């Protein structure tokens, strides 16, 4: 009985692999071969956002493209006016072990969580004028590795217990749990059209979920080590991954297979964060060796380097207007680059 | 020249003042990462010490101690252990009556790249009932390699030496102590260890060490 369906698991895996090789009539590097390189990406830190007293783990831009968030080991979740460096709020956490944070697409709320196995939603636009914890989203059995807002009432999260979950903030309950990673989940993001999302895990597999039904549509397994960072491509047809194997990899959802791997022989440390530029031409990757490298995504030609941190660059984000990239680090300072 | 946004700038300075105040308050406390096997006495040490991740705290000789029992995370340790880089010390403890899982965990902790310089306050717990064990089931039942007498002191010293043999970097010290389950002196052991650590860190800051 069970041996037969183990053999059937092998057979289905071979069917999937044969289909994937059947569709592999080209490799992205040889169809983009005629494209000119993007050139040198020269950039300078236009702001240094001092104020944290310990490791910065996560930051996230506001959709207004000017405000900003920062969660840190210092116990403060503080949000910035990136144009002026002014700290428009400073929020004390109930627990200081926060690994992730997110700014709501409207700006009315900001979320945060970590080793406390809880996602905390903070109401910023309060009548009393202060910032209040509006609900504690409890129910994960592992550290909250990542989180992102769908809308002011729906938030999806990635946990260190190998599950993602989508929450109803009004009731504070999981509307849909996404079981199916064998390792624990690390990073998460949303399709620009918002109907489906991908999640990376330590079993080196990234896979696509639909938010409504909760079924996995495809799984991607080209990595040799745990995947630390995930990011959808600006058009929702592809996504990029960062891993401890020191490579970033690009996957397309209708191709269902790896389109490119980003590597250079000198880099021997894992990626902690990743993002694209507004056009998707640049893949900006944050590495443990104290710098970010910007990859010509259509070429895998490394176009520039954002050096300037005294500790691991822990998080990375690009403004929704595409003007700037913010890099957070274990050095306790963000920097904003143009 | 700023418009009435000078009020927002003034708010920013007011924020910064309390960030600085809370930072000065927080640097005034000592952080201990608490580790060990299940039922080994991780909780018992603080239970005798007057009190997801669970932080525990108590004051002693005008130091404020915060002990984090991160062992509750049944998840990938390599992906969150770096949260505790820059704790003052590790309060690793083991139950003598148990074993080899403790030694494996101790080997992993001592030689982690994050804890390269972080000293370990090793507690060999349950030292009382370990006597009842050793008097009836010699240590060869757990270390068949034990070419020594079934005497109490040498057996305990052999276990201590086997734990300390996992230490591969000269630049850290292991403040091994035995807890005996009546305790009430564990706080003093931790205090002496953190006094040495605080002095050493001051010397690092001054360039003296």
């Amino acid at each position: 009985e069970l041996d037969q369906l183990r053999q059937e698991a092998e057979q289905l895996k071979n069917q999937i692999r044969d289909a994937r090789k059947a569709c592999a009539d080209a490799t992205l590097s040889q169809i983009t071969n005629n494209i000119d390189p993007v050139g040198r990406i020269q950039m300078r830190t236009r702001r240094t956002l001092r104020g944290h007293l310990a490791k910065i783990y996560a930051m996230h831009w506001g959709t207004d493209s000017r405000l900003l968030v920062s969660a840190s080991q210092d116990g403060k979740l503080i949000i910035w006016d990136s144009y002026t460096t002014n700290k428009v709020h400073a929020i004390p956490l109930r627990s200081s072990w926060v690994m992730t944070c997110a700014y709501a697409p409207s700006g009315n709320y900001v979320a945060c969580g970590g080793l406390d196995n809880i996602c905390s939603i903070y109401n910023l636009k309060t009548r009393e004028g202060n910032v209040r914890v509006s609900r504690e989203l409890a129910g994960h059995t592992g550290y909250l590795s990542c989180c992102r807002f769908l809308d002011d009432n729906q938030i999806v999260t990635s946990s260190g217990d190998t599950t993602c979950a989508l929450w109803d903030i009004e009731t504070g309950q999981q509307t849909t749990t996404f079981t199916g990673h064998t390792g624990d989940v690390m990073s998460l993001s949303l399709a620009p059209d918002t109907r489906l999302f991908v999640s990376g895990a330590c079993d080196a597999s990234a896979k696509l979920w639909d938010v409504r039904e909760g079924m996995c549509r495809q799984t991607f397994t080209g990595h040799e080590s745990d995947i630390n960072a995930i990011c959808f491509f600006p058009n929702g047809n592809a996504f990029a991954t960062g891993s401890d194997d020191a490579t970033c990899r690009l996957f397309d959802l209708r191709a269902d297979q790896e389109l490119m791997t980003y590597s250079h022989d000198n880099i021997i440390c894992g990626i902690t964060s990743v993002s694209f530029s507004k056009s998707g031409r640049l893949l900006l990757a944050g590495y443990d060796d104290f710098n970010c490298n910007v990859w010509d995504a259509l070429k895998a030609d490394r176009a520039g380097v954002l050096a300037g941190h005294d500790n691991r660059v822990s998080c990375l984000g690009v403004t929704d207007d595409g003007m700037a990239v913010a890099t957070g680090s274990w050095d306790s300072f963000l920097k904003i680059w143009n | 020249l700023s418009a009435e946004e000078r009020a927002a700038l003034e708010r920013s300075k007011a924020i910064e003042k309390n960030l600085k105040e809370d930072g000065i308050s927080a640097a005034k406390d000592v952080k201990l990462l608490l580790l060990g096997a299940d039922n080994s006495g991780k909780s018992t040490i603080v239970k005798q010490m007057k009190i997801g991740i669970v932080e525990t705290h108590f004051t002693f000789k005008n130091l404020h101690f915060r002990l984090f029992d991160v062992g509750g995370q049944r998840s990938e340790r390599k992906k969150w252990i770096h949260c505790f880089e820059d704790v003052t010390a590790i309060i690793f403890c083991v139950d003598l009556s148990d074993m080899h899982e403790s030694l494996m965990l101790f080997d992993s902790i001592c030689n982690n790249k994050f804890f390269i310089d972080t000293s370990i306050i090793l507690f060999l717990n349950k030292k009382d009932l370990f006597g009842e064990k050793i008097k009836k089931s010699p240590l060869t039942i757990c270390f068949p390699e034990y070419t020594g007498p079934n005497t109490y002191e040498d057996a305990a010293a052999y276990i201590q030496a086997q734990f300390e043999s996992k230490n591969r970097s000269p630049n850290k010290e292991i403040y091994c102590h035995m807890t005996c389950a009546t305790d009430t002196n564990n706080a003093q052991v931790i205090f002496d260890a953190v006094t040495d650590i605080i002095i050493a860190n001051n010397l690092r800051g001054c360039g003296l060490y």
Partner: single-chain antibody
Amino acid sequence: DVQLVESGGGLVQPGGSRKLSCSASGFAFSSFGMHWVRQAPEKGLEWVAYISSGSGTIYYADTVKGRFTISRDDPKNTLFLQMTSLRSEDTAMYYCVRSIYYYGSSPFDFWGQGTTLTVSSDIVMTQATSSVPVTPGESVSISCRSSKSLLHSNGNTYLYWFLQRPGQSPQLLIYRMSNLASGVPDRFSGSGSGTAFTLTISRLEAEDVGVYYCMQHLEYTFGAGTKLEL
């Protein structure tokens, strides 16, 4: 809920002194740079004083500087105005006003009940008419202009709109000429071109009739106040 409630009104002789106190409750008082503004018993609004959060900055109107002094007792959530050497021009009803300043905030977003005090280079705001008749269900346009352009170099233009229903304290409608205040129905919209401004009302409701004041915030002055009539 949020309250700014003042006390200490009454009669005084000219040349005397009196102190009025504002007991804030229901909101994080320490974080707000409260105000004080006043209304002559048959005239419009005017600005009196401003004490910031943490008392780091206080300003006054030139006609009151040196004679009044305002203090904030944060541990008691109480705002004070010590008025000394009163003059006949100082009789009015004084409103305790809320404010908090950060990117995207709404200053002047709440007002107290107010108390009566009766005695035995600035940018000036102008309004085109003192009153106009209206009917429910119609649409109307309020307008006012300033002696200097309120469009600051950063792109914001600092103009506010308030509506005093008869027998009620003012309420904020619009801030920086376009942002509708939280709680005001979407009947109201604002627009302008730096020096000239307007407030547009669509589908007017019978509960909307009152006086409309616009107020600049580019530098430390209300308009005269246009009054709608059913």
